[PDB]
Amino acid sequence: NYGYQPLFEDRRPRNIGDTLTIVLQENVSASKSSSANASRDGKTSFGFDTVPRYLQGL
Amino acid sequence: MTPLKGVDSQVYALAQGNILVGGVNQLNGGRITNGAIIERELPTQFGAGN
Numbered sequence: 001n002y003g004y005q006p007l008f009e010d011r012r013p014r015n016i017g018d019t020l021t022i023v024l025q026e027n028v029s030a031s032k033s034s035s036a037n038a039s040r041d042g043k044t045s046f047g048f049d050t051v052p053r054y055l056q057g058l
Numbered sequence: 059m060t061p062l063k064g065v066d067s068q069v070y071a072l073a074q075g076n077i078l079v080g081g082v083n084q085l086n087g088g089r090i091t092n093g094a095i096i097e098r099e100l101p102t103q104f105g106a107g108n
Binding site for chain 1: 065066067068
């Protein structure tokens with residue numbers, strides 16, 4: 001003799017020892033990224049090609 | 059021949075016979091007189107105690 005069993009309810013596991021099907025469908029995906037940058041240029045110049053006489057002292 | 063189960067899914071009676079439909083009236087439902095025979099008995103505590 002087994003216990004009371006419902007009629008219209010689905011067959012769910014209810015006690016220790018009942019079986020149940022697991023459908024393994026796992027799909028995980030993670031990601032990350034980053035960056036950084038910096039830059040600097042400089043260029044100076046000056047040239048007195050032909051100096052007049054009254055400025056030759058400087 | 060049809061077995062009649064309880065709520066514990068055990069056979070308590072066996073049913074077989076001719077159906078009597080009224081013949082508005084219901085056509086998809088009938089009743090059979092003395093159509094089942096008891097096969098299992100239930101225990102009881104009648105007669106025990108005061």
